[PDB]
Amino acid sequence: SMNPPPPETSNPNKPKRQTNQLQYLLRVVLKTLWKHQFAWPFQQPVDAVKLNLPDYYKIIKTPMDMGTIKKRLENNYYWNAQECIQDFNTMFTNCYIYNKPGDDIVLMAEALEKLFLQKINELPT
């Protein structure tokens, strides 16, 4: 099988806006994770063809990755910050679903998730 098309990063039917919380998610939260040592598996959609994972998209039907999130933020795709936080949590949960506890990539996702929640907590009022 082919790869699925990636998640949409624009949608002409979906109202858009920019907010201070969404700007923080791009300029601080995404930027911090993108530069982390463990970012690389998460910087683009899972290419199940290149990785020889014919079952990846049989198991994971809601894919998400930080390349998509970065484009959504840059495109002002979202209406609110909780939509973007949900995309990060989908990405982490997909990794935990497909893989097993203690696997290398699961420990990498757990480190990124810990840092993610720290950066969210730091959002100034």
In the bound state with ligand F2S, the residue whose beta carbon lies nearer, of 79 and 98, is: 98
Q: Which helix (H) or strand (E) holds 114?
A: helix 104-121
In the bound state with ligand F2S, the residue whose beta carbon lies nearer, of 23 and 43, is: 43
CB burial of residue 58 (10 Å; 0-12, 13-18, 19+): exposed
In the bound state with ligand F2S, the residue whose beta carbon lies nearer, of 105 and 120, is: 105
Q: How far is the CB of 6 from ligand F2S (least distance, A)?
A: 13
Residues that bind ligand F2S (CB under 6 A): 40-42, 46, 51, 53, 95, 98-99, 104-105
Q: How far is the CB of 116 from ligand F2S (least distance, A)?
A: 15
In the bound state with ligand F2S, the residue whose beta carbon lies nearer, of 17 and 50, is: 50
Distance of CA 90 to the CA centre of its chain: 7
Q: Which helix (H) or strand (E) holds 67?
A: helix 66-74
In angstroms and rounded to an integer, the radius of gyration of the C-alpha atoms of the chain is: 15
Q: How far is the CB of 44 from ligand F2S (least distance, A)?
A: 6
Q: Which residues, 6 or more positions from 53, have their beta carbon under 8 angstroms from its beta carbon? A: 46
Q: How far is the CB of 99 from ligand F2S (least distance, A)?
A: 5
